[PDB]
Design a protein around this ligand. Sequence first.
Ligand SMILES: [Ca+2]
Ligand SMILES: [Ca+2]
Ligand SMILES: [Zn+2]
Ligand SMILES: [Zn+2]
Lengths: 96, 96
Amino acid sequence: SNTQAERSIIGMIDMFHKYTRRDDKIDKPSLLTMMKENFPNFLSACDKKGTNYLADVFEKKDKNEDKKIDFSEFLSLLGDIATDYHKQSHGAAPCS
Amino acid sequence: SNTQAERSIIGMIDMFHKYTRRDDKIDKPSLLTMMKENFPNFLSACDKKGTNYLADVFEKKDKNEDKKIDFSEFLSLLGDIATDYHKQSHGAAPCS
Ligand SMILES: [Ca+2]
Ligand SMILES: [Ca+2]
Ligand SMILES: [Zn+2]
Ligand SMILES: [Zn+2]
């Protein structure tokens, strides 16, 4: 009975919780793993452009520099990923 | 070949584009419609709590007050929705 958009959003929460530790936050190695497992085609596109997304994603998204990715920071990362697919649909090359 | 998380994100871009006008932004009536069509169970939960989400969502999310919802503002709205499901998974009542 949930819609597709609702299922999609709930899905990101459960994805998140696949990788958190007991503090409900994601550490650097867990985040790179989350990315390889859940966005391998996104990453591949970047690589083909000469961009290694995982070299700096943790440092870019760990805005408060506590060496963890919290939920708000996780959402911001999903935002960056969404934004690239949005740009592409408007014709930009991927990972622009 | 896209993963579920990748399909989910692409899905939000295409959802967005179901409701935009030629300026690639969503107007107030279109946004309320997007919400009733894609988050009816989210909204229902709110209503049961005495909260009508659509009374103020446009005004809360139209951060630059140009009377449109742009993509960045749309993402922020998805963020609010995600955040409520996250809180719930940690035991909060919905639409808290
Ligand atoms: Ca952090
Ligand atoms: Ca606006
Ligand atoms: Zn959590
Ligand atoms: Zn667009």
